[PDB]
Write a protein that binds this ligand. Structure first.
Ligand SMILES: *[C@@H]1O[C@H](CO)[C@@H](O[C@@H]2O[C@H](CO)[C@@H](O[C@@H]3O[C@H](CO[C@H]4O[C@H](CO)[C@@H](O)[C@H](O)[C@@H]4O)[C@@H](O)[C@H](O[C@H]4O[C@H](CO)[C@@H](O)[C@H](O)[C@@H]4O[C@H]4O[C@H](CO)[C@@H](O)[C@H](O)[C@@H]4O)[C@@H]3O)[C@H](O)[C@H]2NC(C)=O)[C@H](O)[C@H]1NC(C)=O
Ligand SMILES: *[C@@H]1O[C@H](CO)[C@@H](O[C@@H]2O[C@H](CO)[C@@H](O)[C@H](O)[C@H]2NC(C)=O)[C@H](O)[C@H]1NC(C)=O
Ligand SMILES: *[C@@H]1O[C@H](CO)[C@@H](O[C@@H]2O[C@H](CO)[C@@H](O)[C@H](O)[C@H]2NC(C)=O)[C@H](O)[C@H]1NC(C)=O
Ligand SMILES: *[C@@H]1O[C@H](CO)[C@@H](O)[C@H](O)[C@H]1NC(C)=O
Ligand SMILES: *[C@@H]1O[C@H](CO)[C@@H](O)[C@H](O)[C@H]1NC(C)=O
Ligand SMILES: *[C@@H]1O[C@H](CO)[C@@H](O)[C@H](O)[C@H]1NC(C)=O
Ligand SMILES: [Cu+2]
Ligand SMILES: [Cu+2]
Ligand SMILES: [Cu+2]
Ligand SMILES: [Cu+2]
Length: 564
């Protein structure tokens, strides 16, 4: 079962009984369809990458620099077989943005919900249900491994908040370094974040100097409205994108459909995606799709003009001749003035800051490593052998301190968290793209918009900010900007007993230790993981752990970072 009333003119209707107004967190289309995918990870040394430049190593999903798309319809069940044929590295496949409702075992977080799949052809078949529709991506959680090429896309078909004719498809944008993920982890352990060596466009790159590589083409059909699925799968860079000659109508933020909001330029934090509509009401010519940067505290590239080519049907095979206008500095901040079509509502008029709901982000500049990120006084450092689920599926509640477990006992109530971005640090404060596993959150509010490099600090003040907090259907998504030198307020509803990572999606920072682990409804969760139903999941879990704990001691390399 796919659509039965989903047409160019009526995108809001999907099938009888489901549409763009249907609360997807309650009613899910029962389609008796399952879809299977296979993903095979290989490793390649001394390889020639997208832009002709030698890469000392890369790790590829299905022999390409970018993994395939996991496609399916809202409601279908999904089984994805990850085969790890890497030489030495373990792996954890995470399905970013998936709610994993009551399905923690398949989240894909090593040391948290699973043991890493061993190299040399060890595997696991991840099973899960599409209880959402929209655009996302998947990627390794095994250290910074995805920055080596272990990344890919998701696209579950569903309704839309705005009609359109063509659906171009996913459009992954991802920063590109000639250095390897492990060299960059080692580099940033005592150096600031480097710029990218290039930007990829849906799995392609063109070199600034040698003019090698190639421009990526997107074709437009004069007049017809198109839908573009933009993903930022980077490890660091936050992209400002724009299309010369055209505006872009937002109709989805992350896995959440939203009321049509048109923009001229759009800011993409790491992990964020947006679904824009593009009306091709322009002259049959060629138009730059530009990548630009704001404050360098959230990225830059050695490629000063990365772009792709959007071409009208009938247009020649020339290049765009209009270099476009100047793009405004989005100051390392994603826009919040977006209205979800399915509405939510939390009380905000009652928020009172205290230890039990406040997460303090800090950078310990000490020694070995020089740069270390900590939350609430602790750097997270999971154990690839003994995952939190283990402590849960047994009586042991003696979790290690470095697992930074934040327990939440509230049963299906709203829960408020104020993240503070190192406010007493006079020397530095960086923007962080915060991501929650297992939930979408409402973005209740954040400190006043600032230019990061101006160093303007903001601590939470009840007298100024409570009037600015929004509890009546804010933006809700899985990624949002913690402001530089500021603070962010968030809420999710503990409706999914599990252990959920809450971390920074900058590979360098989360390797540095910038994460906590929400142990949500441990009582309910244990009963779940142990129930008859889960036998096949718990047994697989237990199985992949056995082969990893056995392999581990044969590994020639140590664990250099937190593991995440
Ligand atoms: C980034 O790079 C990737 C490549 O990795 C590229 O992805 C390619 O994306 C496109 C668009 O997302 C994919 O094209 C579509 O495939 C679906 C489903 O395919 C399945 O079914 C067919 C049936 O034989 C099988 O062959 C196939 O193997 C799959 O099982 C189709 O449904 C799509 O066709 C629809 O849209 C087309 C126009 O885009 C129409 O020609 C076609 O008639 C269909 O339109 C219909 O659907 C509408 C509903 O919305 C309906 O209202 C209309 O009336 C009509 O019924 C299309 O073929 C492609 O498979 C991807 N994979 C590749 C090529 O590797 C991205 O495109 C790229 N990103 C950008 C932006 O460049
Ligand atoms: C969008 O990208 C295009 C192509 O990369 C940019 O075109 C360049 O413009 C700069 C201006 O300094 C020139 O130095 C380059 O020679 C141009 N390259 C080409 C191929 O023409 C364009 O500048 C970009 N537009 C925006 C808004 O950033
Ligand atoms: C995962 O694979 C990569 C490639 O082997 C490992 O990175 C190498 O590891 C050593 C020891 O840490 C480094 O000194 C080298 O710089 C790395 N090689 C390159 C070219 O990047 C990494 O250590 C492996 N992780 C595991 C699971 O051991
Ligand atoms: C885009 O078109 C150019 C020339 O028209 C071609 O060289 C290039 O390979 C194309 N890009 C893709 C995605 O193949
Ligand atoms: C894009 O929007 C801006 C203002 O939002 C306006 O200047 C411009 O005319 C618009 N262009 C098109 C083609 O929609
Ligand atoms: C931060 O740590 C303090 C003291 O260890 C603890 O009381 C509090 O619960 C922590 N805050 C959060 C958000 O867990
Ligand atoms: Cu992710
Ligand atoms: Cu995630
Ligand atoms: Cu960070
Ligand atoms: Cu994560």
């Amino acid at each position: 079962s796919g659509p039965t009333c989903n047409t160019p003119s009526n995108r809001a209707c999907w099938t009888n009984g489901f549409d763009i107004n249907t609360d997807y967190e309650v009613s899910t289309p029962n389609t008796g369809r399952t879809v299977a995918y296979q993903l095979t990870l290989t490793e390649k040394e001394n390889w020639i990458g997208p832009d002709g430049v030698l890469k000392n190593v890369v790790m590829l999903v299905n022999d390409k620099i970018i993994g395939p798309t996991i496609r399916a319809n809202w409601g279908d069940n999904i089984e994805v077989t990850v085969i790890n044929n890497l030489k030495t590295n373990g792996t954890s496949m995470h399905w970013h943005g998936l709610r994993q409702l009551g399905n923690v075992f398949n989240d894909g977080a090593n040391g948290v919900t699973e043991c890493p799949i061993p190299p040399k052809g060890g595997r696991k078949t991840y099973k899960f249900r599409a209880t959402q529709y929209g655009t996302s991506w998947y990627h390794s959680h095994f250290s910074a491994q995805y920055g080596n090429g272990v990344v890919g896309t998701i696209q579950i078909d569903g309704p839309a908040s705005l009609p359109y004719d063509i659906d171009l498809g996913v459009f992954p944008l991802m920063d590109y370094y000639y250095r390897s993920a492990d060299e960059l982890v080692h580099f940033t352990q005592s150096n600031g974040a480097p710029p990218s060596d290039n930007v990829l466009f849906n799995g392609t790159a063109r070199h600034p100097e040698t003019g090698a590589g190639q421009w990526y083409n997107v074709t437009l059909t004069p007049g017809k409205r198109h839908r573009l699925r933009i993903i930022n799968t980077s490890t660091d860079n936050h992209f400002q994108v724009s299309l010369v000659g055209h505006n872009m109508t937002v109709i989805a933020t992350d896995m959440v459909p939203v009321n049509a909001f048109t923009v001229s330029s759009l800011f993409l934090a790491v992990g964020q995606r947006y679904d824009v509509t593009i009306d091709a009401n322009s002259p049959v010519g060629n138009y730059w799709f530009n990548v630009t940067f704001g404050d360098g505290l959230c990225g830059s590239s050695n490629n000063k003009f990365p772009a792709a080519i959007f071409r009208y049907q009938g247009a020649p095979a020339t290049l765009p001749t209009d270099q476009g206008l100047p793009v405004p500095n989005h100051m390392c901040l994603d826009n919040l003035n977006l209205t979800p079509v399915v509405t939510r509502s939390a009380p905000v008029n009652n928020f009172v800051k205290r230890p039990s709901n406040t997460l303090g982000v800090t950078l310990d500049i000490g020694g070995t490593p020089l740069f270390v990120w900590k939350v609430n006084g602790s750097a997270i450092n999971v154990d690839w052998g003994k995952p939190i689920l283990d402590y849960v599926m047994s009586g042991n509640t003696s979790y290690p301190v470095s697992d930074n477990i934040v327990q939440v006992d509230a049963v299906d109530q709203w829960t408020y968290w104020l993240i503070e971005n190192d406010p007493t640090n006079p020397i530095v404060s960086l923007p962080h793209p915060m991501h929650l596993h297992g939930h979408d959150f409402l973005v209740l509010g954040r400190s006043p918009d600032e230019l990061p490099s101006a160093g303007v600090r903001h601590i939470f003040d009840p007298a100024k900010d409570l009037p600015r907090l929004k509890g009546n259907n804010p933006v809700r998504r899985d990624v949002t900007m913690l402001p530089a030198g500021g603070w962010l307020l968030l809420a999710f509803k503990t409706d999914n007993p599990g252990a959920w990572l809450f971390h920074c999606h900058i590979a360098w920072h989360v390797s540095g230790g910038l994460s906590v682990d929400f142990l949500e409804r441990p009582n309910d969760l244990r009963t779940q993981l142990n129930s008859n139903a889960k036998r096949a999941d718990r047994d697989d879990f237990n199985r992949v752990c056995r082969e990893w704990n056995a392999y581990w001691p044969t590994n020639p390399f140590p664990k250099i970072d937190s593991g995440l």
